[PDB]
């Protein structure tokens, strides 16, 4: 029997709905987000660290001349000085005092430690949600990995369930992100071979362990001018430490709706934005036939005390009478309240003290009991602590969010006003008989 | 414990700095246990809490 | 949760409160001033005899 809901996507709250199935008994359904994991579809652009300088060890050519060839590696870059006359410590390491050249060169390699320190760029193409639902309908509980597109149904014993899409395709990923050791940023990257020097990726390549590894680092090489042989370079400051020190906040701490962020695969979890609609296919052998189950003649509700919280700081008593004992559901059919118990053994006659939540001020909220209904309703007070540790469980509705004395209020001076209104349009309608009642 | 219904009756009562005060209290209770009871008036306290 | 009541600052006086956490049954409070010690601040002007 498939029966469909809009779930909140609240991870950790129970959602709970009382399935009608007339044939059958009322049953109990709580629906449940244990755990969502919401991941985005990525590839890697490239892998960026602090370069190393190799600068490698310089060519000196005494007595002829070096025409310098173009090379693979990164941002590779050298050119020919004359009249260089280079030495070490041995003394003069050439017989020409001119028509002497020195090639000096320079390339970058990952520093050996980016084989653990380093980031990679990761486009996201769409993020789909997995979620792991824990769900309950009668006594008999699942779990279950589902997704929330509409087409893809998972399953557990019995059960068949199929949800979604959610109410927004929110995700926290801006189109461009980088992860860190561990740690996630969502930053708009330079694409790959796009290097500008002194930012961000400033090298990069497909793989640490790649050899077409590029770069742009504004590497140059100044004339050697002292008696040393030597190549005096000078480059930006590697833009993977720049970007380090001046990163801001990673994604992990400013991600909205709450949700947590990790990698392997790049995942946001527990994640709270919007409504999943969900669709459950809950099979009858949960059920009982409705005259097989426990059915009261009469129930009444008291409801006392009762706090709008986003803990269950209301408490209502029932009073019932039932032609038999057993497990009766209970349920609260009004979309801003919501009990605890979701199931009580009845008794031929008796009463049972439920716990419940709302953010109504009022308590004017329908129960049920084994299908029954009784209309509750009690003036809610404000709840004693302003902070709690843990998330409210129903939306503010405006029609209830209104206290009945307020709604009231409310009512009493449109009433005013709108009767005023109709009284004076009926005025002018009856006077305007008037005269033609005469004539 | 919660009580369905509770009504009071007083018996003969002495207004005075002692417990000069009796009343009895009819209840239908869900569960027996011990409940907490209290005046909410300013104007009248109870001896049993 | 707090609960907060004013008390009268009477002593031996076994002042009672009803706590209303009511995400849990009613609580019976007795506040009890045992004794005071109003104390004034002072100090030593001079002894004499």
Known sequence: FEHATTVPNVPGIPYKALVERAGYAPLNLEITVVSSELTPSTNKEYVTCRFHTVIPSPQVKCCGSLECKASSKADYTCRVFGGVYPFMWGGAQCFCDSENTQLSEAYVEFAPDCTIDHAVALKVHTAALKVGLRIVYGNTTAHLDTFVNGVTPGSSRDLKVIAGPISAAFSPFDHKVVIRKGLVYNYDFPEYGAMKPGAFGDIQASSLDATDIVARTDIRLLKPSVKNIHVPYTQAVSGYEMWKNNSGRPLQETAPFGCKIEVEPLRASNCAYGHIPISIDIPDAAFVRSSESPTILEVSCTVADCIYSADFGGSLTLQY???????????????????????????????????????????????????????????????????????????????????????????????????????????????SMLINTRR
């Open 321 to 431: 009478k039932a032609d038999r004992e057993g497990h009766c559901p209970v349920h609260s059919h009004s979309t801003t309240a919501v009990l605890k118990e979701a199931t009580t053994h009845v008794t031929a006659v008796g009463s049972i003290t439920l716990h419940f939540s709302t953010s109504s001020p009022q308590a004017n909220f329908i129960v049920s009991l084994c299908g029954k209904k009784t209309t509750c309703n009690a003036e809610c007070k404000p709840p004693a602590d302003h902070i709690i540790g843990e998330p409210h469980k129903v939306d503010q509705e405006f029609q209830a969010a209104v206290s009945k004395t307020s709604w009231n209020w409310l009512l009493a001076l449109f009433g005013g006003a709108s009767s005023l209104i109709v009284v004076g349009l009926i005025v002018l309608v009856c006077s």
